[PDB]
Amino acid sequence: SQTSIFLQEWDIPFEQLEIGELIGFGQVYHGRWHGEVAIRLIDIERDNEDQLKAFKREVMAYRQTRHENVVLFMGACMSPPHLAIITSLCKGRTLYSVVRDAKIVLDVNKTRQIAQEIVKGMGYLHAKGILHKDLKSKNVFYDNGKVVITDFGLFSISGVLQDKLRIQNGWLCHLAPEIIRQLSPDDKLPFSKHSDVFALGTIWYELHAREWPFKTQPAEAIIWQMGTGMKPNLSQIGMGKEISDILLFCWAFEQEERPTFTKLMDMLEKLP
């Protein structure tokens, strides 16, 4: 019945959609409809008719989700084999490529402000009850600088899991210790709300240290160290008090010990 959704089911008027050049796993196209718009083309897995509640209820719930720190989810339509996600085009670069592009200021004020933008967007998702799961620095755009968040909540169709089992680089250290203990045949993992606040923690580390932890260590090394709760150093100069203390909270071994995004916002607003 509702095993396929259309663009007419969305609140945004769609009479025509054209596709431009390719700029993107998922193939990201530079589409357009009276305003620059990004378009992702992903072929879903065969069969799985039980993906009613996994799409007719999941991705359709992205309607009525509007925020200034979250990308404008235009909508999506899916034929039984195909799928096309439509979203507002970010008029800038990713936070990933700008935190490694020497040399950006990102002082005490800037870094704190950028972190405050992420938690605000994640806070709106914290209220709507949607887990980002794959919260990386590659899923955040900066320009004005106007910070927005994309590739949120949509797992399974996206990366970065797949008889050896393949794991990404950055996402491996974005995971919370309860989730860094996976086997080879697995989503359906213990993803919580504290899972997302952990991912922000390594992003908060990524902001000050200009990159994510475990910079040289091999995959198996990350799994065990982060699995035993061996949180990386922060006194690599120069942080000190105020800063780095929040890192310990967002990287707590017990998920209950980690603050919520709404609670986290107060810890950032306190200045150094």
Binding site: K164, R166, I180, R181, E220, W224
Partner: protein, 309 residues
Amino acid sequence: ELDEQQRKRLEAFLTQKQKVGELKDDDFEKISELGAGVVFKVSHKPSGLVMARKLIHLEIKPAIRNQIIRELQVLHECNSPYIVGFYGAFYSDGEISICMEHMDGGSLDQVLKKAGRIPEQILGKVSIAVIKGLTYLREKHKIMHRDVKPSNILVNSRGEIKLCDFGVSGQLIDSMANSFVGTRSYMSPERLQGTHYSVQSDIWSMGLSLVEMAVGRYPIPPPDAKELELMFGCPMAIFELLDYIVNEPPPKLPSAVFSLEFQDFVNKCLIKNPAERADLKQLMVHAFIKRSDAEEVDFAGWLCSTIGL
């Protein structure tokens, strides 16, 4: 360290290596495939020589490949009787290709899966091949293997035992994003803890391998009380595996079956403490090595009696 007949086979490779000025993507007519994790047994047309071409998807910009292939030419001086002599390296569309010396017998991981369990007499000859392979790399090139697996030891029908795929081009390693983990790890406990690793870290991988080669099963976790009783003759998470390597006693060879020399050999390698662990020098003068060094085994004869040719 030099052998008369091995001096012949090496310089016979230097001749057919100068037959190719530059490598072309169309010179390699596709024939077959070795495996994936993706190697090809292609056929070079100008030189007229069949070799093992290896390629894996890589989306990089031209500014990166100029420094990837740059550090990829170090393998030229790394020609050894116990190291697979490579030819060259280039770029194709969106994947880097590397052609090495073809080994018509394949890796030991394939051989182990076919023969079931490899005899102790043969493992002795293979053991010496690994030691000199790591020593030659560390003394003359200041480079360690960084990753020793049963699938990284190539063997041909000519009787040669050589190594392959070791860390040398550090620029290429960063390009290999999202890599596979595996249900079977050969990581040393000190690397899992993040501590600095020496060439003795590869020794752990060598010892952990040898146990698997001997029993025909991955050592961790140790077999039951009924499993080992029905293996004589002729569902865990990844983190739990790695944690067992750190805080639990090392694997061990079955008693009675193997000689005490071979039992002691793998135990000197599987010491969880790298400091008290044997080094490349201590292993070279071990009782098992000195005995297996004088052994006379038809290595190519037993090999072709299992996989053919």
